[PDB]
């Protein structure tokens, strides 16, 4: 829907993902009831990366409609969640450089430099690479 340009029905689907990542957990085999994805669709890495995405996906659409409050919320949420995507920190710090640069930005620089792939499934890897921006490191060196 984003490529076909339709804020509404798109942000339907970013919110509808995000609910099935929170008012559900995947990690629920209480019964050996079937055959399952063992690997791909259980990783806590797969989950904290997939959240971090749907929230990144939404935060953009919130800036395409001009609600930097909502976008801020959703980006700040992915950060708190999965600190080692780093495209999360890029989008938030882009948001902060616009509005409220100094203190917030530097506090998160120091956090990134304090911080410093395992089995992510293919559809997501590629999708992260596909959304992610080129001057990402360029922005993080300013």
């Amino acid at each position: 829907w984003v490529q076909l340009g339709a804020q509404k029905v798109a942000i339907s689907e970013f919110s509808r993902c995000l609910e099935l990542l929170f008012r559900a957990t995947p990690e629920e085999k209480e019964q050996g009831a079937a055959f399952n994805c063992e690997q791909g669709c259980k990783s806590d890495a797969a989950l904290q990366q997939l959240r971090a995405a749907a929230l990144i996906s939404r935060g953009l659409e919130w800036v395409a409609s001009g609600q930097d409050t909502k976008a801020l919320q959703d980006f700040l949420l992915s950060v708190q969640m999965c600190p080692g995507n780093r495209d999360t920190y890029f989008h938030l710090l882009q948001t902060l450089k616009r509005l409220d640069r100094r203190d917030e930005a530097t506090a998160l620089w120091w956090r990134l430099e304090a911080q410093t792939l395992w089995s992510l499934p293919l559809y997501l890897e590629s999708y992260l690479s596909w959304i992610r921006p080129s001057d990402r490191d360029a922005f993080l060196e300013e």
């Binding site: 509404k8 942000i11 339907s12 919110s15 509808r16 995000l18 609910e19 929170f22 008012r23 919320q73």
Partner: protein, 340 residues
Amino acid sequence: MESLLQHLDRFSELLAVSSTTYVSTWDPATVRRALQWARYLRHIHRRFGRHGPIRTALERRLHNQWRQEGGFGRGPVPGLANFQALGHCDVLLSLRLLENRALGDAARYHLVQQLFPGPGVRDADEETLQESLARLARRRSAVHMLRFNGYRENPNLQEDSLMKTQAELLLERLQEVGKAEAERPARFLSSLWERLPQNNFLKVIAVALLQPPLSGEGSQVLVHWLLGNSEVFAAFCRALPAGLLTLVTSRHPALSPVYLGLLTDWGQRLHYDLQKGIWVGTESQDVPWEELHNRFQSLCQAPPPLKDKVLTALETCKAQDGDFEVPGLSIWTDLLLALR
């Protein structure tokens, strides 16, 4: 007619100073004088109390007394409250003099002897003071026993008794001020608002709006006071239960649109967190989701002339905040969904 003014006002002064502790000068003469004046008033109340211009003249003197004193400054003296209080002035006087510790000992003996002879005048054609005083203690001990052995707060405050009665004291006390037209009910209710405990007060007022008419000019006055002063009405909607405001509204449609206005204004200072699937407020006092669900729950659970109003006031504030048809965006979508 003018013969009674000079009598009654000097008696009013005597009554007012009765409970004040300067009682040293007093004697059997003062007590006798008091009680014979009171018998005279009690006979006045009996004889030419009903359907007199004398009736209305006495009330004017009374209510003008109660407004020139105020409930303000020198002393908030009750006094004998109104037209009916002429009938048992005696007893008010009697009760107060006993509380008064400065009462000299000779006066107290002669007093009590005059109040309760005995059964020496068991044959008394008029109900004497003695019998009223028994009756009092009786109802009085009576009311103790009900209260602590079978009274309960009805939840529907409308169908409680204390509230239901305190309302009626308020309605009578504004019916008099309305006839007087000296001060507007506004000023009275402003002073009230400072003076007495607010939670109590509001429930009274709430229930007062509902009591079917007794002479509804009373109810009609309170809505003008409320809609006039916004700040109190904000606390009202906040303090009560839901069904109470529901019935407030269906009775008085002048309250529908501003009440809804206050909910609109509370919903728009929330925010969602994703991790607990719940609307919550920022600030500690910000009426929670719990509470807000409930009141709209109710308002909908109402007669047809309000349900349509409120339901349309939802669809309008929904569209203003994006027509999403999924939760986690529009507080108001949320609600409309939560009503099925």
